[PDB]
Design a protein around this ligand. Structure first.
Ligand SMILES: [Cl-]
Ligand SMILES: [Cl-]
Ligand SMILES: [K+]
Ligand SMILES: [K+]
Lengths: 461, 461
């Protein structure tokens, strides 16, 4: 039944407002950490993202508590996930470290107050200028992704007379890695690469690195890949006569985007989280401890830190009914279109990666969501509507939904800011933060008109 | 054979440098309008796009010549395709008009020198502020996309005491429109919508509008949809006792992304252009002339104006070989990975829309492209490699390819600039223009570090 789908969705809605650590209701409205989101969306122009420092902290706690059995664990937030400076500041103040994915990511992490010894710099294209900047800033780790890059690390560390601290990335063939994995070295190359680093005067080998993937719905991939890295670490300690400082096992802890696990198969629909942080930690720690209990384990969670910790707020800005008629002029069906002021230039993964986010009427959060609608964005593009619905391409909202109501997309905190575009010269969005005291502030402005053209060089008028 | 695929690709390569109006060779390098692109990519940091004003002009000529049988044709470049100010200036100087897709697009078109009477403003979400700005600027057309929006057009035109010039967008059900087309009104709503506009004191009804789609590989959709709009225009002239100024038939003229038409089926692979501008014009004009030969026809080409008129230049910045071994340690296959400094944050449609672009070694353009390689970008994302290869996910480059060589992606002028992101805080690219005299200048800067953080509000260090 669609009645059953509708019943289930309204049970989920009730659980948001009565059963979720993040949310409440007041005045008929969805609240996030006590902040009425209808009211918030009248103080700031839509569309915008609102982050929760309290929920970031809760997510970091899940991660760190998961690793309680291994004291020497170091946690580096994968800042490609979200690098708005106030988001990075909340993460730094919560007591963890940072992983960076470009020269400018390294620089902004340093600027917001991560120390060099709290930063890992990873990449497949680390040009001489990138490596010089990283080495000059005494980073905790720079990964070694290829033999070509390693030659630049040797030459530049020598030039600067500064030790480059490295981890060698090895991507295991776990049953095709050569064809589908661009990153890292082959297992077969690890020994000679490590031997060569040991002989370099200004490069310090700290350990091996891997990263399995993103939104991983099973523990086995982590266990099998970690075992490969652990076995090679153990073997190289013996062969080379060294003791590694660490092992870096990467990220990939999933986040629930659908919550009714009893109705989902995570291996078929990875919007269902197939595993928890505790499952990830159990797999990793168990494998590492077969080698050493004292070695440092570095992890690089991205999505899990911020994914659940933001909402996208977008105003219903237009509506229409489209009707299909048969050849005799009789109605075949009606479609109720609701247009919000955010499209895929604002929420890119909803279009490009078939990503599901819960959608509710934040202005009518206590009302039955009892009408099937299609949800469109504002871009001049027939494809700019939200295809990942509750049932096919259809969403559920109260039949009473009105232009002016605020729609919320939940779990909108990972990979949603830097992926925005200025397609159609709609601006990239502002971003608001709810701090630990429940107070709000703007942490990113909406792009202005000046910002659309300030990059261009042209004869003025 | 893959030998046959390789032979065919090298025949295409030879045709680029001996048989293409845009390109030549010099010093072993690809040249665009006489500009050596290897040399250009040493003067400006990669990756960057280079546009050709001469090729934009040639494309506009194709379009306008296609409409020679209808004198009263007005051509509006769909500026969502590319709105870098120097690109818009070239289009304005070539003598055509502009279609705009947001308030800021309208504003930049006015700023670069399109007059109000040369601008169409389209949209599904035209908020009061957008409509007020458009009406105040005396635009040639503002489309009417819904009854809800029309109420704002009436109220705001009355407030300003300024006539709003409109075209009513009608999306025909051509064998599901209600379910798949968010834009426009139903045919069945056109009569009453027009009747109501006629009665408004400050709204001027000019005609009907449609837009079929993008990269359309057959003429029939245009002919059938145009006939629907023409038949309803004729009928409403009679019923309402009026004479329409115009009919706006939209865009969608395709561009060839693969050129060996003898080997392609455009209905299965629409990288093959299934039709030319002349085919589009023949379909449209034939249908309009069954009603009136004097009425103005408005067209809204986007992709066809700029698609063929840019190249993305990107340096080979790293390389590696990955090898799959069997359980006995014997080699199963090798993969030669070449890493360029542009990934899907720079060339978004290569990832998100399965878009093919020809790829050549611009530094070795006269050398046989005789080695199968995989082409990766620089993002820290396993999916950031180019999947739309010559054969599956494999490309062809000279075996002699070296780090430092410049790779060119052809046909990179449509939907490639505003769709860029700062994912991983890699900057959005600079843009260079080759003018009519063959001289180059920077028309957009690369985003600087300041630009990564200038939008953020945070406590300084
Ligand atoms: Cl830590
Ligand atoms: Cl014109
Ligand atoms: K060493
Ligand atoms: K009127």
């Amino acid at each position: 039944m669609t009645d059953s789908i509708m019943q289930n969705y309204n049970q989920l809605r009730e659980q948001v407002i009565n059963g979720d650590r993040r949310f409440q209701h007041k005045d008929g409205h969805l609240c996030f950490e006590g902040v009425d989101l209808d009211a918030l969306a009248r103080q700031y122009p839509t569309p915008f993202y609102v982050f929760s420092e309290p929920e970031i902290i809760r997510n970091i706690h899940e991660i760190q508590q998961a690793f309680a059995a291994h004291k020497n664990t170091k946690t580096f937030f994968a800042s490609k996930t979200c690098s708005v400076m106030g988001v990075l500041k909340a993460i730094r103040d919560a007591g963890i470290c940072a992983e960076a994915n470009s020269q400018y990511e390294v620089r902004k992490c340093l600027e917001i107050g991560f120390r060099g010894d709290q930063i890992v710099f990873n990449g497949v294209v680390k040009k001489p200028a990138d490596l010089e900047y990283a080495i000059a800033n005494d980073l905790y780790l720079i990964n070694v992704d290829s033999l070509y890059e390693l030659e630049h690390i040797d030459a530049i560390s020598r030039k600067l007379k500064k030790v480059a601290n490295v981890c060698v990335r090895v991507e295991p063939n776990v049953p095709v890695t050569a064809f589908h994995a661009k990153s890292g070295l082959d297992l077969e190359q690890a020994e000679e690469t490590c031997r060569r680093i040991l002989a370099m005067p200004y490069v310090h080998l700290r350990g091996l690195h891997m990263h399995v993937g993103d939104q991983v719905p099973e523990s086995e991939p982590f266990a099998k890949a970690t075992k490969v890295l652990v076995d090679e670490s153990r073997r190289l300690e013996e062969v080379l006569g060294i003791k590694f400082d660490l092992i870096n096992v990467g990220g990939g802890i999933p986040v629930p985007y659908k919550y009714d696990d009893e109705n989902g198969d995570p291996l078929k629909d990875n919007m269902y989280a197939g595993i928890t942080a505790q499952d990830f930690a159990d797999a990793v720690i168990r494998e590492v401890h077969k080698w050493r209990t004292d070695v440092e384990i570095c992890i690089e969670p991205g999505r899990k830190v911020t994914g659940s910790a933001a909402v996208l707020l977008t105003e219903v800005s237009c509506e229409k009914r489209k009707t299909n008629y048969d050849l005799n002029g009789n109605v075949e069906c009606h479609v109720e279109w609701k247009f919000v002021d955010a499209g895929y230039s604002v929420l890119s993964d909803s279009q490009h990666f078939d990503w599901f986010f819960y959608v509710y009427n934040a202005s009518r959060m206590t009302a039955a969501h009892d009408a099937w609608i299609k949800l469109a964005g504002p871009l001049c593009d027939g494809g700019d509507y939200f295809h990942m619905g509750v049932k096919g391409e259809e969403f559920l909202l109260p039949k009473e939904t009105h232009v002016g109501d605020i729609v919320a997309f939940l779990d909108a905190g990972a990979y949603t800011i830097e992926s925005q575009t200025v397609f159609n010269n709609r601006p990239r969005t502002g971003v608001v933060m709810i701090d630990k005291n429940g107070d709000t502030r703007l942490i990113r402005r909406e792009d202005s008109y000046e910002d659309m053209v300030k990059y261009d060089i042209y004869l003025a008028a």
